Structures are given as structure tokens and as C-alpha cells.
């Protein structure tokens, strides 16, 4: 029973750098190996077949190599369009096993985020809830800290975050933080703030608003 | 030009059944084998089923060997996957995919090679849960003349995934950031979709988010204004 072992699991590199991902078959499979590229949001896409032949559309920066038990996908000049997860697979027979995949991302020049804050809507407030949203837009690297403050009282655990996959247009990330309180707990306080610490920031930037103002 | 499109998907509780469909357009459907391959939220790609270009179900994943049955119609260009006795392990996104191997000439019987899938469909989401489907509430995320303004829509309290969000009925695409859904403690997904537009447009252009949640037949238009 043949197992496919991909490596590394994740991988990051600057634009134009060389990048290598390797697939290992538990036993000799000759050249029956395909590579697939799953871009963020989209279905997987065949790139290399027969270990070394690339599909009609794939650019020159992609090459496949190796045989038997060891296979290599190489991107000689990494582009942000190549952002996604890569899978190897042994075709020809059941059960067409895939490798666990390799997430590939872009190292970029540091970029400071554009921060926005959104008060709850009246419609939602009528329902008994309040969601305040802090938006961190187009930043690099991915590591960013969002700190909610309710009248300078530090919040923790009562919020939830979501980060976009790396955009190929500018190699940046975006983050959305949601602080959810009851309408009753919400209308007891005045100043709601989101404080953002990021590598591209000289010092924590705060975006705040006053309830009812 | 060659495309595959999946239909079906949604909640179905553990123990019972749903039927997935896949229609194709752009190639000669009769001379290609078809795969069903799935992807669980934390798992790799997992091949599920395979039917020959004619009539042969050369394979099922061992974990579905008697549960799923894959079918095909070369007159309607259609491939189906009947899923019975579903479990949480079957919860995933299901794609139908064309095998790269064609057919060529007969001579002997048909041959059946399998070069292992080249073109995939968009996929359809199947959630196996005892939980109830809920439609999302859609709330505005409004701003407050110079600078870059940000607008948004909060798609809150829905189940299951996914929802789609467009802007101005597909006209506005640039600057849109739709965030991956977050699983709240309530067991309901919540999502935001933002867009950065020039502030000057806030008094001229109209900004509307379109939220679609198929599993509950939800389609909401929301006007976001400062």
C-alpha cells in the first residue's frame, strides 16, 4: 500500500527566488506522478505530468525532476501568482494517493496595514447583539496583533479573527477582527477601540469611536 | 473552455443520503473517465470514486466501497455520485474531475489506462451534521472629505458553509476582500466582506453587497451607506 510523503509542509520565499518541493513514494513508481497547484479559493490545477512534462499552460519557471521514489517540483523564479498549496499524486491505479500538500507563500518588503473600525449596525442592535469590526488591510508580514479596548479596558478571548490568504496582486494579507457583545453590555460603555501592533508600524496604531457619536 | 460543474451539496445528517451531480461542457465526454475527489477542511486531497469512459466503476475508496455508487450518462454528459449512509468522515468539498487519458482506437476491447485527472470542477460542499441549517443575517459595515474609505458586509450566524458575496451585482471586484468564515462558539459561521473605495465616491456611487447562502436558499442585497 503506497504512501506519498511531501516536504516541506509550508514554505516561504521572496520573488524570483528558487523553490523546491519534494514528493516521496514508499516504493518505486517510475514516472507515474502528477503535480497539482491549488491557488487560494480555486480548485486544484494540473501542472506537471509524467514527473517532468508540464501541462500546455504552465510557465517556464516550473520544472519537474526525479524518478522512482523521489520527485521534485521546482520554481526557478518564484512569482506571487504561484501562491497556493501543491500536491503530488501517483496515478495509474487505485486509490490515486496524494501527498499531504505544501503551502507556498511570498516573502515581501514589509508593509504597514491600513486600519479601519466599524460600529455595530442599528438593525443588529435591535436583535440584542453588537458586533464591532476592526479591519487590517494590505500588510506584510502576516504576524499582527489586534487588541480590543472598551473604555481602555483590555479585552481578551471575546473576539474572533480571520486572515485572508496571501493576495497575488501585492503579496499582502488582510485581517478582520470581530468583537461581539450583548446590546446591554455594549450600551454601558462609550469608547470602543482597536489597537494594532505590526512590524511595519513604528508604534501601536489605535482606531476608536464613541458610542452614539 | 473545458469545464465541469458540480451540484448537490448541503447538510444531510449522519446515516442518510445525498446525490451529487456533475455536468460538463467543452470536451468529448464519451471518451474520458471521471473521478470524484474530495477535500476535508484539515485534510489533503482524497480520491473517492472513478468511472470509466463507458461503463466501469474501476474503483471506490475502500472507506466508501459499499456506501457510495458512481454513475454516468453519455447521452446527457452527466456524472453522478450517490452517497448513502453518510458520516462525519464524509464531510468535505467534492470535485468531479476529468482524467487526462483520452481513448484512441479500439482493436481490442476498450483499454482503461487512467493518467490521473487534469481538469477539475469548482466543487460542491457537503456537510454531514445533526445541526440545523440557518440563514445568515447581513449587516452593513459603514464608514464616516478625503482619504481611502472602507465599506463592508457582516454575514453573521449561518450554517453550513459556504456563502458567496459579490458587490454591485458582480460589477465591483477591485479592492474587495472577502474573509474566510469564522466558527463562533454558537457553532455558527460568521464572515465579513470589505472593499476599499475612494472616499469621494461615497456621495456618488452606490455600494451593495449580494449575499448568497444556497443551503437555506438565502439571497440578500444590502445597501451600505455612511
Provide Rg for chain A, Cα atoms.
23
Residue after which a domain boundary falls, among B67, B95, B130:
B130
β partners of residue A130: A181
Nearest-Cα distance to chain B for A76, in Å, is: 23
CA distance A65 to A54: 11
One-letter-per-residue 3-state SS of chain A:
CCCEEEECCEEEEECCCCEEEEEEECCCCCCCEEEEEECCCCCCEEEEECCCEECCCCCCCEEEEEECCEEEEEECCCCHHHCEEEEEEECCCCCCCECCCEEEEEECCCECCEEEEECCCHHHHHCCEEEEEEEEEEEECCCEEEEEEECCEECCCCEEEEECCCCCCCCCEEEEEEEEEEHHHHCCCCEEEEEEEECCCCCCEEEEEECCC
Q: Which three cell numbers stand for residue B137?
A: 443575517
Chain A residues in contact with B156 (beta carbon < 8 A): 124, 131
Q: Please give the tally of structural domains in chain B.
A: 2
Query: Which is it for the CA torsion B85, B99, B30, B28, positive or negative?
Result: positive
Chain B residues in contact with A179 (beta carbon < 8 A): none
For residue B44, the 8-state DSSP code is: -
CA distances (Å), origin A84, targets A104, A152, A195: 6, 40, 30
- CB nearest to B139's CB, from A89, A121, A135: A121
**B183 is in which domain, residue-wise?**
131-226
Q: Are residues B98 and B150 in the same domain?
A: no
Residue after which a domain boundary falls, among B72, B96, B130:
B130
Query: Which is it for the CA torsion A136, A141, A143, A145, positive or negative?
Result: negative
> By CA distance, what is B179's nearest residue in A?
A164
B2-33 as b/e, with b when 16 or more CB fall inside 10 Å? eebebebbebbeeeeebebbbbbeebebeebb
CA distance B129 to B192: 24
- Which domains can be identified in chain A, with CATH numbers? 1-107 (2.60.40.10), 108-213 (2.60.40.10)
Nearest-Cα distance to chain B for A115, in Å, is: 9
> By CA distance, what is A88's nearest residue in B?
B45
Q: Are residues B15 and B76 in the same domain?
A: yes
By the 8 A CB rule, do A126 and A120 touch? no
Chain A residues within 8 A (CB-CB) of chain B? 32, 34, 36, 43-46, 49, 55, 87, 89-101, 114, 116, 118, 120-121, 123-124, 127, 131, 133, 135, 137, 160-165, 174, 176, 178, 180
| B45–A101 C-beta distance less than 8 A | yes
Determine the residue among A1, A31, A94 to mutate to test chain B binding: the one whose Cβ has the most chain B Cβ atoms within 10 Å. A94
Q: Are residues B149 and B219 in the same domain?
A: yes
CA distances (Å), origin A48, targets A55, A57, A89, A103, A133: 6, 10, 10, 17, 43
Q: Are residues B155 and B107 in the same domain?
A: no
Q: Are residues B126 and B152 in the same domain?
A: no
Chain B residues in contact with A176 (beta carbon < 8 A): 179, 192, 194
Q: Are residues B17 and B107 in the same domain?
A: yes
CATH number, domain with residue B158: 2.60.40.10
C-alpha closest to that of B155 among B142, B170, B140, B144? B140
Q: Are residues B91 and B144 in the same domain?
A: no
| A93–B45 C-beta distance less than 8 A | no
Q: Are residues B13 and B95 in the same domain?
A: yes
Q: Are residues B97 and B25 in the same domain?
A: yes
Q: Are residues B124 and B150 in the same domain?
A: no
- CB nearest to B44's CB, from A98, A120, A165: A98
Determine the residue among B24, B116, B151, B199 to mutate to test chain A binding: the one whose Cβ has the most chain A Cβ atoms within 10 Å. B116
Residue after which a domain boundary falls, among B86, B105, B130:
B130
CA distance A105 to A14: 9
Experimental method: X-ray
What's the resolution in A?
2.5
DSSP string, B125-143: EEEE-SSPPBPPEEEEE--
Chain B residues in contact with A123 (beta carbon < 8 A): 139-140
Q: Are residues B116 and B145 in the same domain?
A: no
Q: Are residues B106 and B138 in the same domain?
A: no
CA distance B216 to B202: 33
| B115–A87 C-beta distance less than 8 A | no
CA distance B195 to B177: 6
Torsion on CA atoms A110, A113, A114, A117, rounded to nearest 10: 180
Amino acid at each position: 500500500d503506497i504512501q506519498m510523503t511531501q516536504s516541506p509542509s509550508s514554505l516561504s520565499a521572496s520573488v524570483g527566488d528558487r523553490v523546491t518541493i519534494t514528493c516521496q513514494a514508499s516504493q518505486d513508481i517510475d514516472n507515474y506522478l502528477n503535480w497539482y497547484q491549488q491557488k487560494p479559493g480555486k480548485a486544484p490545477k494540473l501542472l506537471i505530468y509524467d514527473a517532468s512534462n508540464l501541462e500546455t499552460g504552465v510557465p517556464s519557471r516550473f520544472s519537474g525532476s526525479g524518478s522512482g521514489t523521489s520527485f521534485t517540483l521546482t520554481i526557478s523564479s518564484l512569482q506571487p501568482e504561484d501562491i497556493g498549496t501543491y500536491y503530488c499524486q501517483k496515478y495509474g491505479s487505485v486509490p490515486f494517493p496524494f501527498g499531504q500538500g505544501t503551502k507556498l507563500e511570498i516573502k515581501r518588503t514589509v508593509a504597514a496595514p491600513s486600519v479601519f473600525i466599524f460600529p455595530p449596525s442599528d438593525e443588529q442592535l435591535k436583535s440584542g447583539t453588537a458586533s464591532v469590526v476592526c479591519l487590517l488591510n494590505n500588510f506584510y508580514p502576516r504576524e499582527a496583533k489586534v487588541q480590543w479596548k472598551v473604555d481602555n479596558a483590555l479585552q481578551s478571548g471575546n473576539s474572533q479573527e480571520s486572515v485572508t490568504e496571501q493576495d497575488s496582486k501585492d503579496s499582502t494579507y488582510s485581517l478582520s477582527s470581530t468583537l461581539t457583545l450583548s446590546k446591554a453590555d455594549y450600551e454601558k460603555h462609550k469608547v470602543y477601540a482597536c489597537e494594532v501592533t505590526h512590524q511595519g508600524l513604528s508604534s501601536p496604531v489605535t482606531k476608536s469611536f464613541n458610542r452614539g457619536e | 473552455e473545458v469545464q465541469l460543474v458540480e451540484s448537490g451539496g448541503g447538510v444531510v445528517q449522519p446515516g442518510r443520503s445525498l446525490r451529487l451531480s456533475c455536468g460538463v461542457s467543452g470536451f468529448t465526454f464519451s471518451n474520458y473517465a471521471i473521478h470524484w475527489v474530495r477535500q476535508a477542511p484539515g485534510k489533503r486531497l482524497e480520491w473517492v470514486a472513478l468511472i470509466s469512459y463507458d461503463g466501469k466503476k474501476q474503483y471506490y475508496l475502500d472507506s466508501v466501497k459499499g456506501r457510495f455508487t458512481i454513475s454516468r450518462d453519455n447521452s446527457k454528459d452527466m456524472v453522478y455520485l450517490q452517497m448513502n449512509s453518510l458520516k462525519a468522515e464524509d464531510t468535505a468539498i467534492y470535485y468531479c474531475a476529468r482524467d487526462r487519458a483520452r481513448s484512441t482506437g479500439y482493436f481490442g476491447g476498450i483499454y482503461y489506462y487512467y493518467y490521473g485527472m487534469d481538469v477539475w470542477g469548482q466543487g460542491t460542499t457537503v456537510t454531514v451534521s445533526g445541526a440545523s441549517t440557518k440563514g445568515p443575517s447581513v449587516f452593513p459595515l459603514a464608514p464616516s472629505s478625503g482619504g481611502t474609505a472602507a465599506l463592508g458586509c457582516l454575514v453573521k450566524d449561518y450554517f453550513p458553509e459556504p456563502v458567496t458575496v459579490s458587490w454591485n451585482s458582480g460589477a465591483l471586484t477591485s479592492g474587495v476582500h472577502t474573509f474566510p468564515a469564522v466558527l463562533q462558539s454558537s457553532g455558527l459561521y460568521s464572515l465579513s466582506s470589505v472593499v476599499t473605495v475612494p472616499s469621494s465616491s461615497l456621495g456618488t456611487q452606490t455600494y451593495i453587497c449580494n449575499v448568497n447562502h444556497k443551503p437555506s436558499n438565502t439571497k440578500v442585497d444590502k445597501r451600505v451607506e455612511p
